[PDB]
A = this chain, B = another copy of it.
Amino acid sequence: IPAPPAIADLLASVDSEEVREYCKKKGWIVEVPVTATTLERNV
């Protein structure tokens, strides 16, 4: 399991949709569902 800032440095150069899947599979990153978040609208 690599370090969080190492993930970032990797993506900055090579970020693509395939990498995101790989990082997700290895469990390096964890997708947050919308159900775990809230929205706020204002004017």
Contact = CB atoms under 8 A, between A and B. Distances in A.
A14 to B, nearest CB: 5
Interface residues of A, number: 10
DSSP majority for the A interface? helix
For this chain, the copies found in one complex come to 2
A7 B41 CA distance: 44
A13 interface: yes
B22 A14 contact: yes
8 contacts: A2-B2, A2-B6, A10-B22, A13-B18, A13-B25, A14-B16, A14-B18, A14-B19
The 7 closest A-B pairs by CB, nearest first: A13-B22, A14-B18, A14-B22, A14-B19, A2-B2, A10-B22, A2-B6
